Write a protein that binds this ligand. Structure first.
Ligand SMILES: [Cl-]
Length: 151
């Protein structure tokens, strides 16, 4: 569960979520899994590299493990589904739905933690390819908000 050398994961994650500049330094772009969307033709899958300009900054609230029971009926669950000394995977989503976030963390040979892959519902398979550019701009605007409180 806990690494015997290098960076402590919980301490890393607190720094990662508290500073945008630091966060960007600890993501290995392009991520392992590219963004995959269906073309308008309705048959061809198109991939786009998951690069720095597309990254939605992750805050401390998002990275908390918890179970949210909503009055309107949903149960939203976030948890580390893999929790090994040098390899962790965080998943979040509504119970009985597909997940809307998966973040994969690995402690590299230098002892530092990095994000090496991510699935985010911002770029879900349900996103029309024609909306990708504007979605990326929306993420930029969210990131501007993040940077007002977590530079
Ligand atoms: Cl409730």
């Amino acid at each position: 569960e806990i690494a015997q050398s290098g960076e402590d994961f919980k301490s890393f994650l607190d720094k990662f979520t508290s500073s945008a500049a630091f966060q960007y330094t600890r993501i290995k772009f392009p991520l392992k899994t590219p963004i995959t969307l269906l073309a308008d033709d309705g048959e061809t899958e198109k991939t786009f590299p998951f690069t720095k300009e597309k990254w939605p900054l992750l805050d401390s609230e998002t990275m908390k493990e918890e179970r949210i029971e909503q009055e309107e009926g949903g149960i939203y669950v976030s948890k580390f589904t893999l929790n090994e000394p040098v390899h962790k995977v965080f998943e979040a989503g509504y119970e009985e739905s597909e997940i809307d976030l998966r973040v994969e963390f690995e402690q590299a040979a230098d002892g530092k933690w990095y994000v090496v892959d991510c699935y985010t519902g911002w770029y879900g398979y349900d996103l029309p390819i024609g909306e990708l550019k504007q979605t990326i701009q929306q993420v930029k605007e969210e990131n501007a908000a993040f940077k007002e409180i977590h530079p």
